[PDB]
Amino acid sequence: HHWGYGKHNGPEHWHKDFPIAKGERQSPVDIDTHTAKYDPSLKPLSVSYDQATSLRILNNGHAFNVEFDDSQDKAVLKGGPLDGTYRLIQFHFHWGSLDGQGSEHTVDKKKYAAELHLVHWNTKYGDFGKAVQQPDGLAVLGIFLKVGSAKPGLQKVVDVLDSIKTKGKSADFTNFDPRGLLPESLDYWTYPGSLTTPPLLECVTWIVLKEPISVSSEQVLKFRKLNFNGEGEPEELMVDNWRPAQPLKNRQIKASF
Numbered sequence: 001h002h003w004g005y006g007k008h009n010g011p012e013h014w015h016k017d018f019p020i021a022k023g024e025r026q027s028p029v030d031i032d033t034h035t036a037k038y039d040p041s042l043k044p045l046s047v048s049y050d051q052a053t054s055l056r057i058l059n060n061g062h063a064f065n066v067e068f069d070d071s072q073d074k075a076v077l078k079g080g081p082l083d084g085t086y087r088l089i090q091f092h093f094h095w096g097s098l099d100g101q102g103s104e105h106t107v108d109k110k111k112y113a114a115e116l117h118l119v120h121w122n123t124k125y126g127d128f129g130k131a132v133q134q135p136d137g138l139a140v141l142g143i144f145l146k147v148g149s150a151k152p153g154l155q156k157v158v159d160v161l162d163s164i165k166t167k168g169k170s171a172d173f174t175n176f177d178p179r180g181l182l183p184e185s186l187d188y189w190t191y192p193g194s195l196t197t198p199p200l201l202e203c204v205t206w207i208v209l210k211e212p213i214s215v216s217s218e219q220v221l222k223f224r225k226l227n228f229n230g231e232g233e234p235e236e237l238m239v240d241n242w243r244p245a246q247p248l249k250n251r252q253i254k255a256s257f
């Protein structure tokens with residue numbers, strides 16, 4: 001009886017195994033655009049993904065992760081609200097059963113169709129597993145997806161999904177360039193929060209871009225054909241793999257713009 005996204009194991013149950021689920025800095029949150037504070041001290045986000053080395057894509061049973069080589073300073077995030085340098089380890093998405101839901105963060109209660117999380121760890125902690133034990137260990141860049149025009153830079157990911165349909169499947173995924181997933185603007189909101197799946201650790205500086213990317217209906221429909229089950233088990237479509245907004249608990253969300 002492990003956690004996942006249902007009536008009996010979904011987000012409202014997670015606190016029994018991970019009591020930090022009711023903590024002081026949980027994610028996601030609703031971003032109240034009118035109450036977010038413009039902070040002139042915030043710097044442009046520096047996203048330096050030229051040398052990224054995509055290795056593999058994995059169906060982990062909750063989402064799919066596109067993995068990177070994080071054994072050298074290659075793809076790194078810095079600037080923004082960050083001190084120091086954060087290495088890209090993986091990205092994944094959360095999405096809905098319907099276009100009207102799927103994002104984790106919300107904007108004035110608006111839910112997007114999906115949300116991309118580019119996960120980075122602070123190089124001062126030496127690797128990811130140590131970083132998650134620190135309050136400034138991770139920086140997750142969140143990007144909303146809306147359904148409209150296709151995102152051409154997403155298609156390589158969509159087309160490999162049939163090869164990783166079920167939990168535990170992986171496939172080689174080299175030369176994937178995550179720059180093709182970024183909107184034009186890097187304007188952002190930021191706040192201190194947590195992992196949005198167990199273990200829900202309170203180790204994340206969230207950086208949520210204001211500008212969404214457009215993906216096609218056909219692209220998100222392919223997300224929705226993935227499976228949360230493993231091969232040889234009854235089919236459970238991988239949909240609605242998002243945690244609802246959690247209490248802000250008087251954290252301030254700061255705007256770069």
Ligand SMILES: NS(=O)(=O)c1ccc2ccccc2c1
Pocket residue numbers: 117119140194195196197198199200
């Ligand atoms: N969804 S999220 O907050 O970006 C996220 C990112 C990295 C994770 C690594 C392990 C467990 C949970 C994780 C959650």
Ligand code: NA
Pocket residue numbers: 148216217218
């Ligand atoms: Na369409």
Ligand SMILES: [Zn+2]
Pocket residue numbers: 092093094117196
């Ligand atoms: Zn995530």
